[PDB]
Amino acid sequence: DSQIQFTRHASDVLLNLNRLRSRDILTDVVIVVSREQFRAHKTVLMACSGLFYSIFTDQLKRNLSVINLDPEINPEGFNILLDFMYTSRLNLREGNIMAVMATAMYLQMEHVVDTCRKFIKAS
Amino acid sequence: DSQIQFTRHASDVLLNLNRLRSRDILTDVVIVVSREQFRAHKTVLMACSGLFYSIFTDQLKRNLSVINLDPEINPEGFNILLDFMYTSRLNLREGNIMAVMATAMYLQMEHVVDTCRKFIKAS
Ligand SMILES: CC(=O)Nc1cc(Nc2cc(NC3CC3)n3ncc(C#N)c3n2)ccc1N1CC[C@@H](N(C)C)C1
Ligand SMILES: CC(=O)Nc1cc(Nc2cc(NC3CC3)n3ncc(C#N)c3n2)ccc1N1CC[C@@H](N(C)C)C1
Numbered sequence: 001d002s003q004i005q006f007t008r009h010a011s012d013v014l015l016n017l018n019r020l021r022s023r024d025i026l027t028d029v030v031i032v033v034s035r036e037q038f039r040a041h042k043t044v045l046m047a048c049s050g051l052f053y054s055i056f057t058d059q060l061k062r063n064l065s066v067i068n069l070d071p072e073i074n075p076e077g078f079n080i081l082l083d084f085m086y087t088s089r090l091n092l093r094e095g096n097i098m099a100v101m102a103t104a105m106y107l108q109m110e111h112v113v114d115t116c117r118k119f120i121k122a123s
Numbered sequence: 124d125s126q127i128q129f130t131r132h133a134s135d136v137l138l139n140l141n142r143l144r145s146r147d148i149l150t151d152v153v154i155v156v157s158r159e160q161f162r163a164h165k166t167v168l169m170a171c172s173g174l175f176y177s178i179f180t181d182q183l184k185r186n187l188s189v190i191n192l193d194p195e196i197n198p199e200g201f202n203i204l205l206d207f208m209y210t211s212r213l214n215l216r217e218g219n220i221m222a223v224m225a226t227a228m229y230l231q232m233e234h235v236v237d238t239c240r241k242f243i244k245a246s
Contacts, residue, residue, distance in 0.1 A: 001212060004238065009211035010133035016170035025180065026166050028149075041166055043149050047139035057148065088132035089124060115127065 011088065017044055018086040031082075032068045036075040038082055048085040050108025070106060077103035084112065092119050134211065140167055141209040154205075155191045159198040161205055171208040173231025193229060200226035207235065215242050 020026055020041070027039040045052035055061045069078070077099035084090045090112060092100060101116035143149055143164070150162040168175035178184045192201070200222035207213045213235060215223060224239035 003210075003212035003214045006207075006211045006213065006234065006238075009207075009234075010137040013167065013170045013208070014133040014136055017166055020166055020169060026151075026169070026185070043140055043143055043164055043166065044136065046143060046149070047136045062149070084129075084132075085136070087126075088129045089126035090129065091126045111129065111132075115129075 014086065014088065017041065021086060028065065030066050031078070032066060033073050033075045033078045034071060036079075038075075038079065040082060040085075044085055048109065049081075050110070051106065054108070073103055073106060074099050081107060081109065081112065090115065092116065094123060097123075137209065137211065140164065144209060151188065153189050154201070155189060156196050156198045156201045157194060159202075161198075161202065163205060163208075167208055171232065172204075173233070174229065177231070196226055196229060197222050204230060204232065204235065213238065215239065217246060220246075 021039070021044075024039060027041055029040055029042050029045070031038045031040060031045075042052070042056050046056050047053075052067075055064070055067065076096060080091050080096065080100050081103055090100075092115075097116060097119055101113060101120075104112040104116060144162070144167075147162060150164055152163055152165050152168070154161045154163060154168075165175070165179050169179050170176075175190075178187070178190065199219060203214050203219065203223050204226055213223075215238075220239060220242055224236060224243075227235040227239060
């Protein structure tokens, strides 16, 4: 708009939110993926994932402190996407592309799915 | 680093966090400023303000659901700064510059204080 724009503010906020996650500060959910557990902030999950948005926006599930994901989801692909949510950085490799793309479709992360489509196309 | 960088991800996350604030979704604190009240997410307050960081990082105050700010703080300057936290946009005018700068010092928002110093200098 007309206001002063701070071009690094959003990235600085996100870095600080990742710092809070690293310290378990104000995390409010544990995501269970196969044999693994990942703590996060529901607000960040909602902001990034259509699946988590759909779950937590509903007053029926808003206050859940544990979410068990589909057992078929592999913790590797989930961890890469959780890190992406909190960093804007996506670790796509040839050895992980299929697991990451299938996990991003499940998480309803359209931008990441489209980027995976670009990765397969360039390889 | 070496990972794919999503240049709009942090701003998109912040926009979605402001959308949750607008809907009172997962807000966990009310900030009382004179006769006014403002709801927010403690994680965003911590990420942006050295005062709120110092308060909520301490296990003694981490779970507080109400924070009463210094009565001398005016809700106008506070609201401009809260909006800045959630948008990267700072509404500085000649009629509000003094109230905004004094509130940013109180909130320990160094980048905003330095920018206010630049505003007074240009006027
Ligand atoms: C299933 C779902 O929830 N889909 C969704 C939500 C929204 N709206 C949203 C979305 C988010 N976050 C999710 C990560 C993106 N957030 N965060 C805070 C608020 C608020 N208030 C909010 N509102 C818009 C579009 C969509 N799509 C439906 C069709 C899809 N494409 C195939 C075209 C896109
Ligand atoms: C009073 C305080 O807390 N000051 C502070 C905190 C930190 N560290 C932080 C700060 C933040 N957010 C606040 C808005 C910036 N966050 N968010 C998450 C984490 C974690 N983990 C975190 N860690 C670093 C520098 C400082 N300053 C001390 C000297 C100051 N200048 C005058 C030079 C700067």
